[PDB]
Amino acid sequence: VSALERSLRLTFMDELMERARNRDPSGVSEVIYDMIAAGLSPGPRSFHGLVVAHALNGDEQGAMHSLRKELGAGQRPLPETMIALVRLSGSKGNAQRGLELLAAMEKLNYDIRQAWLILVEELVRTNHLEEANKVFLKGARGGMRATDQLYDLMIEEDCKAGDHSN
Amino acid sequence: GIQRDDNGRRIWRRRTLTKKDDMLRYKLQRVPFVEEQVRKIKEVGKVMTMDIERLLLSEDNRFEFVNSVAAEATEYVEKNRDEYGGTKKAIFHVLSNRVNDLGFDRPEAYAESDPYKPGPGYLKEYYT
């Protein structure tokens, strides 16, 4: 890794992250193809930027396509990419997609507790109390421990809904 | 307290008892004629009674201990049905594993046989 390659990667990554922070997944793909043309292999950081760009403007299908591209590229996705995907699924209420992402994270030797908390909290926030309860109970029977705030939130919301069983 | 004896080695004061404890001489003595007693204890299975008492020293409620042992034995039987019921008993296996989990070595499920059986077909006749 020379200083020339490092500088080229710095410029390309800065432009890619600037486009990703601007909710422009197409521009991020443009920068990725520019990296391919220039010989710079897209690392997990670039695919993370692409996934974030897709996820910021509520685009679950494109985010999953970006994850598939990252996997097919042979790169190992970052924990941030996976937690962004699970948060997007929770915001959309896609509980099963979130569980699949959690299983993938577990398969890639990652701590799924924080992502599980994010998923259940987002499901609660978007008024998906049934799926939130299901995912929370799956995680709790699986041995995971939730925060005190999450315990109180689940209990209070379930009792407000009249759901004594959960 | 730091002192080096000019060669890189650090000389330090060793800690010693420097006092008389009469309980040392009187207590570290061994009885010499308990071979048959120990062997009979192992044969009849009183070591398992000692183990059962030891396991209950860490249990607030003994009924909970019994329930947990029964549940673990049930799991053992469900997972490997064919390994139990004969020379290996599930509850004895659970007890031995719980004793072994503390770092104390025990034969598996307290399973023992008689090496002196005179071939197949001969059954020991107990002397009441």
């Binding site: 994850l67 598939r68 996997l71 097919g72 590229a73 042979g74 699949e100 992402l101 299983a103 993938a104 398969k107 890639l108 | 009924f63 019994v66 329930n67």
Partner: peptide
């Protein structure tokens, strides 16, 4: 007594190589 108190991503998506 003992009755008291009621007693797949990452697959089909590997690197082509």
């Amino acid at each position: 007594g003992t009755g008291f108190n009621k007693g797949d991503i990452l697959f089909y998506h590997r690197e082509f190589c």
